[PDB]
Design an enzyme around this catalytic site. Structure first.
Site, PDB file in Angstrom:
ATOM      1  N   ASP A  12      53.212  24.119  18.916  1.00 38.06           N
ATOM      2  CA  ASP A  12      52.469  23.079  18.217  1.00 38.06           C
ATOM      3  C   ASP A  12      52.173  23.444  16.771  1.00 38.06           C
ATOM      4  O   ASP A  12      51.187  24.144  16.499  1.00 38.06           O
ATOM      5  CB  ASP A  12      51.148  22.806  18.977  1.00 38.06           C
ATOM      6  N   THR A  13      53.006  22.950  15.838  1.00 38.73           N
ATOM      7  CA  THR A  13      52.796  23.213  14.417  1.00 38.73           C
ATOM      8  C   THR A  13      51.544  22.511  13.883  1.00 38.73           C
ATOM      9  O   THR A  13      51.022  22.863  12.806  1.00 38.73           O
ATOM     10  CB  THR A  13      54.023  22.777  13.585  1.00 38.73           C
ATOM     11  N   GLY A  14      51.027  21.513  14.611  1.00 43.41           N
ATOM     12  CA  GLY A  14      49.838  20.760  14.182  1.00 43.41           C
ATOM     13  C   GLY A  14      48.546  21.422  14.629  1.00 43.41           C
ATOM     14  O   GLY A  14      47.428  20.903  14.439  1.00 43.41           O
TER      15      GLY A  14
HETATM   16  C1  LIG Z   1      46.649  18.572  21.847  1.00 40.91           C
HETATM   17  C2  LIG Z   1      48.111  18.213  21.668  1.00 40.91           C
HETATM   18  C3  LIG Z   1      48.757  18.191  23.053  1.00 40.91           C
HETATM   19  C4  LIG Z   1      48.243  16.799  21.053  1.00 40.91           C
HETATM   20  N1  LIG Z   1      47.697  16.624  19.674  1.00 40.91           N
HETATM   21  C5  LIG Z   1      48.559  17.093  18.511  1.00 40.91           C
HETATM   22  C6  LIG Z   1      48.058  18.450  17.902  1.00 40.91           C
HETATM   23  O1  LIG Z   1      49.019  19.058  17.034  1.00 40.91           O
HETATM   24  C7  LIG Z   1      46.696  18.331  17.136  1.00 40.91           C
HETATM   25  C8  LIG Z   1      46.766  17.655  15.711  1.00 40.91           C
HETATM   26  C9  LIG Z   1      45.370  17.536  15.065  1.00 40.91           C
HETATM   27  C10 LIG Z   1      45.024  18.315  13.946  1.00 40.91           C
HETATM   28  C11 LIG Z   1      43.740  18.244  13.367  1.00 40.91           C
HETATM   29  C12 LIG Z   1      42.764  17.432  13.973  1.00 40.91           C
HETATM   30  C13 LIG Z   1      43.086  16.651  15.090  1.00 40.91           C
HETATM   31  C14 LIG Z   1      44.388  16.708  15.650  1.00 40.91           C
HETATM   32  N2  LIG Z   1      46.146  19.655  16.956  1.00 40.91           N
HETATM   33  C15 LIG Z   1      45.018  20.109  17.568  1.00 40.91           C
HETATM   34  O2  LIG Z   1      44.339  19.399  18.389  1.00 40.91           O
HETATM   35  O3  LIG Z   1      44.699  21.465  17.217  1.00 40.91           O
HETATM   36  C16 LIG Z   1      43.350  21.927  17.546  1.00 40.91           C
HETATM   37  C17 LIG Z   1      43.500  23.453  17.826  1.00 40.91           C
HETATM   38  O4  LIG Z   1      43.730  24.082  16.544  1.00 40.91           O
HETATM   39  C18 LIG Z   1      42.999  23.276  15.622  1.00 40.91           C
HETATM   40  O5  LIG Z   1      43.685  22.999  14.384  1.00 40.91           O
HETATM   41  C19 LIG Z   1      43.806  21.555  14.435  1.00 40.91           C
HETATM   42  C20 LIG Z   1      42.552  21.028  15.179  1.00 40.91           C
HETATM   43  C21 LIG Z   1      42.520  22.061  16.272  1.00 40.91           C
HETATM   44  S1  LIG Z   1      46.775  15.119  19.346  1.00 40.91           S
HETATM   45  O6  LIG Z   1      46.318  15.086  17.831  1.00 40.91           O
HETATM   46  O7  LIG Z   1      45.525  15.006  20.308  1.00 40.91           O
HETATM   47  C22 LIG Z   1      47.831  13.626  19.574  1.00 40.91           C
HETATM   48  C23 LIG Z   1      48.062  13.115  20.856  1.00 40.91           C
HETATM   49  C24 LIG Z   1      48.947  12.025  21.029  1.00 40.91           C
HETATM   50  C25 LIG Z   1      49.644  11.534  19.909  1.00 40.91           C
HETATM   51  N3  LIG Z   1      50.544  10.506  20.046  1.00 40.91           N
HETATM   52  C26 LIG Z   1      49.446  12.094  18.628  1.00 40.91           C
HETATM   53  C27 LIG Z   1      48.555  13.170  18.459  1.00 40.91           C
END
Ligand SMILES: CC(C)CN(C[C@@H](O)[C@H](Cc1ccccc1)NC(=O)O[C@H]1CO[C@H]2OCC[C@H]21)S(=O)(=O)c1ccc(N)cc1
Ligand SMILES: [Cl-]
Ligand SMILES: [Cl-]
Ligand code: NA
Lengths: 99, 99
Positions: free
Chosen positions: B25-27
């Site tokens: 997960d790059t996000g």
């Molecule tokens: C949890 C994953 C299975 C799914 N997520 C994508 C994910 O990359 C998110 C993307 C993201 C990023 C920032 C804020 C909210 C969501 N990152 C995330 O929740 O990371 C958390 C852990 O490390 C932290 O750094 C980021 C927030 C923390 S998600 O944002 O809930 C999502 C779910 C469904 C869709 N269609 C689009 C996005």
């Protein structure tokens, strides 16, 4: 380009005529953008991740320019904390994870 | 490997002798795994995802194998929808985004 992951992989996107910053996110299935107006029909959807679900509007056949590359696909719009370019549009610009 | 994104980029990880499935997960900033026991002390952390904030347990300097590459670093434990390998360990295994 080759993007390392020392920092968040942010890029500029153009959508609905607007410039925005967005995160390139291999962990997301469908692209989600902060509240904005888009043309055409939509339908409601719930999407979920850490912390739970949010309600979004689903718009189909939307064009986005991502770091200079055109892609078309579904865009979800709602109260996401960050703009997310997900796998549905990353495949279209030929993006891969390499190690 | 070169991983396309037409499907979820799921890999096998090994932590505490156990194999588990995880998403690259790059996000994500830090790595989050579903409840399990890990050695040593933990520190509190809140992380904010798409639907809001949650409390997790932060364990440092945990050994984890990821698709056969060894990493040692911070692992958060809490109610995540799926195990997620985030940028803090993707950098350790040399991953980049390419397009
Ligand atoms: C949890 C994953 C299975 C799914 N997520 C994508 C994910 O990359 C998110 C993307 C993201 C990023 C920032 C804020 C909210 C969501 N990152 C995330 O929740 O990371 C958390 C852990 O490390 C932290 O750094 C980021 C927030 C923390 S998600 O944002 O809930 C999502 C779910 C469904 C869709 N269609 C689009 C996005
Ligand atoms: Cl799509
Ligand atoms: Cl606590
Ligand atoms: Na449409």
């Amino acid at each position: 380009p080759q993007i390392t992951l020392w920092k968040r992989p942010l890029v500029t996107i153009k959508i609905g005529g607007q410039l925005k910053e967005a995160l390139l996110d291999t962990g997301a299935d469908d692209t989600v953008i902060e509240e904005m107006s888009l043309p055409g029909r939509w339908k409601p959807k719930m999407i979920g991740g850490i912390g739970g679900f949010i309600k979004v509007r689903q718009y189909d056949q939307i064009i986005i320019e991502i770091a200079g590359h055109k892609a078309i696909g579904t865009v979800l719009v709602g109260p996401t904390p960050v703009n997310i370019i997900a796998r549905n549009l990353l495949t279209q610009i030929g993006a891969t994870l390499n190690f």
